[PDB]
Symmetry: C2
Subunit: 528 residues, 2 copies
């Protein structure tokens, strides 16, 4: 009895949501159709289909472009409704081969592509015009996901729920604010952020930092505490922090910063030192590649006190003032080699980059923890911690029914640490093992973030979060890696591991990324 009647329903005018990337939103709005380019929902042919969700906020998080990193460009969410009655069939989390057999399908054709079988429809349809499969394989969310037959999905009426592609590189600002709207009235840990307008934050922080560095009298005194380009220490960076807090423009934040109510001088100073060390990387560029470096420096949230700032009565001002101070501090501390860049343009880029990162962090900080901290055989390194969800997750089955496999890894940090999750390195083999990017995600505090996976095809592949992910004890994350297996004989994996890459390491101009490695067992038994 593979059907789960308690979750299966028959719905009239069935409506669900689908998030589309900038390149695909316009084609999706004009009609749902199997794309010729891409994976068509799954690298496993059995599960190829149109994927929707009952959570329009979760669909909004799948509008981020994965063309670039921190591009700020988003697509939009479509509301898709069927004519007539639809059967949402819930089934057990089993392999497609087993599902095909227990539901009376042909084993030699894809499972989802057969949801419109005449015989299958009569037996399980409950009289409905079609059947849409509720997603068997799990997700960290309390949301429900649906897999549609590609030919059936052509019958959907498509409408715009929300779109961000007309905002250009400010689209993800609106996506972040729209997703957070699930926390707003009509929940002690769930914070509504409606009092923060990201356009206000960017414009006010740009004005505030401009007024400060245009005060030549004040800026010269800032040269006594620290001279731009010289080696910055925690003592120098802390004094530079408090010298900046003395300016009239930071009066709303001075008290709360000095007391620990919003952040701490020691947290911003430690982040400033780490930002200056990270920019000694010859490949880095503070003016033209600001996001690349700031994205891999730990503790940006605590350098802003963002978890504190979003609960303050004067929220927008506190956030503007905390971001402004951190931008001015980083610009004063960043190493100078050769001709120094224009300080005003440097502060502008630093403020812009900080806001690009704070938006995503503020969304995660407004949500209570949802992911387990317990793992099997955790690995730790420089604050970074990764472990297997359960014993069963530390496995890869390349035999028996071939197809979609899953691996769940617990991602966290040591107490007081905030580690960027940059990417995961996984094993692939062009003959029999594929990474399944569209179906890979990371769950943190109820937010589901898609993964963008690329091929080195030296039997290695890299997967990166399409949105910045920072790991802490208070915000543990679960990485859901999806693989696809196909039929082979005598195939093997010489490196059965998963690498977790974090913050940048710098030792005497030499650069690497913080890494932890987990090892799994490869099962080649085609018995089960």
């Amino acid at each position: 009895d593979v059907v789960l009647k308690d979750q299966s329903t028959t719905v009239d005018s069935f409506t669900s949501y689908h998030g589309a990337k900038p390149e695909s939103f316009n084609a999706v709005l004009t009609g749902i159709k199997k794309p010729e380019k891409g994976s068509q929902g799954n690298n496993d042919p059995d599960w190829k289909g149109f994927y929707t969700t009952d959570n329009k906020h979760a669909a909004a998080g799948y509008t981020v472009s994965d063309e670039s990193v921190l591009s700020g460009k988003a697509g939009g969410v479509v509301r898709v409704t069927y004519p007539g009655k639809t059967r949402i069939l819930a089934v057990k989390s089993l392999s497609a081969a087993e599902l095909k057999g227990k539901l009376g399908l042909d084993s030699a054709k894809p499972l989802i592509d057969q949801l419109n079988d005449k015989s299958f429809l009569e037996k399980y349809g409950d009289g409905a015009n079609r059947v849409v499969l509720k997603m068997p394989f799990a997700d960290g969310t309390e949301d429900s996901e649906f897999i549609h037959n590609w030919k059936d999905a052509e019958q959907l009426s498509v409408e715009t729920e929300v779109r961000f592609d007309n905002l250009g590189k400010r689209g993800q600002d609106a996506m972040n604010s729209y997703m957070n709207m699930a926390n707003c009235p009509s929940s002690p840990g769930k914070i509504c952020l409606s009092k923060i307008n990201w356009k206000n934050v960017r414009e006010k922080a740009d004005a505030l930092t401009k007024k400060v560095h245009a005060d030549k009298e004040f800026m010269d005194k800032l040269s006594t505490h620290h001279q731009r380009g010289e080696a910055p220490s925690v003592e120098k960076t802390t004094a530079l922090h408090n010298a900046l807090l003395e300016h009239e423009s930071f009066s709303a934040l001075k008290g709360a910063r000095a007391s620990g109510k919003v952040g701490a001088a020691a947290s911003t100073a430690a982040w400033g030192v780490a930002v200056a060390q990270a920019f000694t990387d010859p490949k880095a560029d503070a003016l033209t590649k600001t996001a690349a470096t700031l994205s891999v420096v730990p503790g940006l949230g605590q350098a802003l006190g963002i978890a504190d700032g979003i609960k303050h009565e004067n929220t927008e001002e506190i956030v503007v003032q905390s971001i402004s101070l951190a931008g001015l501090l980083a610009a004063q501390a960043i190493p100078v080699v050769g001709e120094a860049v224009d300080f005003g343009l440097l502060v502008y880029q630093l403020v812009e980059t900080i806001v690009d990162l704070a938006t995503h962090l503020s969304s995660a900080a407004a949500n209570p923890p949802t992911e387990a901290t317990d793992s099997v055989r955790p690995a730790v390194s420089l604050g970074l911690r990764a472990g297997w969800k359960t014993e069963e997750d530390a496995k890869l089955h390349i035999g028996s029914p071939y197809g979609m496999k899953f691996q769940r890894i617990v991602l966290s940090a040591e107490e007081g640490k905030e580690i960027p999750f940059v990417r995961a390195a996984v094993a692939v083999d062009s003959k029999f093992l594929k990474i399944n990017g569209p179906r890979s995600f990371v769950v943190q505090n109820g937010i589901k973030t898609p993964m963008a996976c690329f091929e080195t095809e030296g039997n290695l592949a890299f997967c990166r979060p399409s949105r910045p992910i920072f790991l802490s004890s208070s915000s543990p994350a679960t990485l859901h890696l999806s693989y696809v297996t196909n039929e082979h004989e005598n195939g093997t994996i010489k490196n059965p591991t998963v690498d977790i890459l974090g913050q940048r390491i710098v030792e005497n101009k030499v650069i690497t990324a913080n890494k932890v490695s987990l090892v799994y067992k490869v099962d080649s038994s085609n018995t089960l």
Copy 2:
């Protein structure tokens, strides 16, 4: 067909050499006997026996104490001779179970413990009084090793070849000098170091650094280039290096250092910054735990130009002056937190620690490379590189015939780097997997260094080289990991990996060791 006639011989008054640690040398000298404490040559009962070598210089390298790290204490080498005739039986590198069956021994008893079987003696002895097995499983050296039956070994006459246990913490000075004597008259790259007296180097470097730091006029001028305890930079450290080199006491090295003939100012300056950062570790201590930190900081050899200094005509003076400058430079750059340590005592401890390390490094520098640089699936991290010797090495067989297994890993650095090989973390299981320390070693430039292995018994084990090993492209090393497997049912390995730990990493007072990890395949098949 297991017998190798081309390598088997029949010898009268067969003599070989055995290196004993400080704790065991005196009991070995009075007679050879199976020790009640320890592994008795091998954690595998089949291979338990007395182990000797035909190379007395390699035996000297197995006299170092493994009680402590960089203790400077060594035991000695005994020359052991049998009465009458001995047959050295060379056999193929096979498992003891296969050897026992093919040689007509009982399969239910230890192999080496059966070398005095009457039938075995008659068939394979060639008329000799005993049979001594040449070590089947390999080693990187061109030396020959012999495995003796423990009851047979009681017949050996024991003499002293050389001993170092009367030198206290200076035994390894003489052991290093005695081992290098294999390069001395009676190949361009093999360097004889007979012109260096390590006791002179310590005495002269202590005198030289004292004369400098007792020069208040000169020392005050050194506070302008750098003030003790202040943030060390590469630029500041380089100027500190050149300011020290201007002193009259460094005139014999000033020219060669400035030109690159012996080291380079940038090499000494980079090491000084890294030493200063490493001593920001809250657990480190520059005065009482100097060796602990200096042992895990890359590039000590190039900070001395040791490979150049040992080829110089004025060898001892160049080496004395090179060590003196690095000690004064490091003492000037090391962070000062709280009450500062006495500057003279810090320079003293830094000079002695550098000499404690330079002796081993100079021995490796006097030898041409012998180990391959090509490996299977190398892993790299911050200059550290480790790979499997061959595809067969990336495997562990816990089934089939149980017993002694081997894993060879190629260890090197990236071009221009000198990475300390601190230790290797391996997997063990009290039920079926044991680390086999006595038979684990690392070979670098023809020198065989013993491994000391300890237990976490959380399914992990740590093995460290008993002498400092620094990895470079010009001095590749091969780590020989030895395991023992025993009979088990359903035993499994959750972490089939080997960690290789190198230099210390420093991030905002946070400390870890540079690590590279290799993964092998576990085979439980009963072939």
